[PDB]
Design a protein around this ligand. Structure first.
Ligand SMILES: [Cl-]
Ligand SMILES: [Cl-]
Lengths: 131, 131
């Protein structure tokens, strides 16, 4: 069925997107959440852990580990504001500027290898109509 | 960042797709797996549970309730090939043909409301490039 085919392509497109993340995750040995945090940090600049929590869904039991790991991979570092102590500010580690460019270029590659298929899927999805 | 914004739209498009499923789920009181099963059944025709499980990822612990609920909602019915196999064949309940059309139309409407947003997001994603 043509309508049914198009609707089912929602799942195909979702799969494309999760696959791209899978590719990044395996190459860079990071979690989905870590990748999203790094991207958000690059988009919005340094911020507190609490603030980042609003942009990226990190479940409480993996939170400490997630940020601690980003620190150990040397992607970020932490700062303690001198009049809050229980607030943690995170910053991109500029020493890893070249690695940042490399990662973004890899993500670009993974997107490019999927771009035609994703648009073809979205075309099928959007082509779904009433009957 | 043009690149970073575009990569982050992967998650936006993902959210769009899952919000469609959420909307159907709340309207029709079904899980995503049930929706995918019905669609696959309409696409491919009658088949065994074993065959359906290879088309739609349904966690083993959820399988029995998933199909039983489709039977309770009267979307499908079960058959056992002779003499009485361990095999369960499921069929679409043709009595619900008009219901099928209305569900498909509902999903079509959900897709149409998001078509502009999804294509804009995919445009941002595919625009991602090297530097
Ligand atoms: Cl904080
Ligand atoms: Cl079976």
């Amino acid at each position: 069925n043509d309508t049914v085919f198009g609707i089912l392509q929602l799942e195909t497109l979702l799969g494309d997107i999760n696959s791209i993340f899978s590719e990044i995750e395996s190459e860079y040995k990071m979690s989905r959440e870590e990748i999203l945090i790094l991207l958000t940090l690059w988009q919005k600049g340094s911020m507190t852990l609490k603030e980042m929590d609003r942009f990226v869904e990190v479940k409480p039991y993996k939170r400490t580990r997630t940020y601690n790991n980003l620190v150990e991979l040397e992607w970020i570092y932490k700062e303690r504001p001198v009049d809050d102590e229980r607030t943690v500010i995170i910053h991109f580690n500029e020493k890893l500027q070249q690695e940042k460019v490399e990662l973004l270029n890899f993500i670009s590659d993974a997107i490019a290898s999927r771009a035609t298929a994703m648009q073809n899927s979205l075309n099928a999805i959007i082509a779904v109509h009433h009957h």
